Amino acid sequence: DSSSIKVLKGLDAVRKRPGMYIGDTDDGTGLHHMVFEVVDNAIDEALAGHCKEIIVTIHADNSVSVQDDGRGIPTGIHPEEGVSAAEVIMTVLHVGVSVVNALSQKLELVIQREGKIHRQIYEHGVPQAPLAVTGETEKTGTMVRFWPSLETFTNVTEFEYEILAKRLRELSFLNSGVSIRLRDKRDGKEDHFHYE
Ligand SMILES: CNc1cccc2cc(C(=O)Nc3ccc(C(=O)O)cc3)c(=O)[nH]c12
Numbered sequence: 001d002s003s004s005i006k007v008l009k010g011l012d013a014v015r016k017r018p019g020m021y022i023g024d025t026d027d028g029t030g031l032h033h034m035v036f037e038v039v040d041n042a043i044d045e046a047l048a049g050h051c052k053e054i055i056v057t058i059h060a061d062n063s064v065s066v067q068d069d070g071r072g073i074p075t076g077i078h079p080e081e082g083v084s085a086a087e088v089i090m091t092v093l094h095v096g097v098s099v100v101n102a103l104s105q106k107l108e109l110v111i112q113r114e115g116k117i118h119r120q121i122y123e124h125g126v127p128q129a130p131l132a133v134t135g136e137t138e139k140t141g142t143m144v145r146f147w148p149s150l151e152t153f154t155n156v157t158e159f160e161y162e163i164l165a166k167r168l169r170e171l172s173f174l175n176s177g178v179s180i181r182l183r184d185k186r187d188g189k190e191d192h193f194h195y196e
Contacts (some may be wrong), residue, residue: 072113
């Protein structure tokens, strides 16, 4: 199946030359760019008028989650490639959320839409299983939590609050109307960014 082959070549490509996709993997810039890429996806959903709140969280285990209250990534199985439209978005190259997926040792996807909660787990960009319904809900949105591969990233491996805060504040400025929360579980620090 062409599609599976393609996807794995893409993932492999990104892990072999991460500099070409995420930036420097020693100085922290690439590592923080992982967060910004995921956030940019949530910003699109806000720009489209479906997302009002985005929540960025620094977890104690040095992963980062991004939650929006948008529509939820479509979950219906694409006829054309045999898996959830969400998995296509998470894995197909073109920088795209697939790059962050490729360079994460684990990624967790939680989608709320059409009354159902769906969940999928990825490792180094590869799904452990197809997207599956775990429950019901009245809410909508997309939550992506990722744990960056320490095979890829060295030296600066811990997320730095201030670096995330500066960029998220910039993004709220550029995208007037979007409301962004940043919360650090390591010490309870939090901020709310919202402009005009
Ligand atoms: C944390 N959030 C987050 C992380 C990473 C990727 C995405 C991707 C989307 C997205 O693709 N939404 C979307 C919604 C509806 C439809 C439709 O046709 O109904 C098509 C696309 C998103 O909303 N949020 C994301």
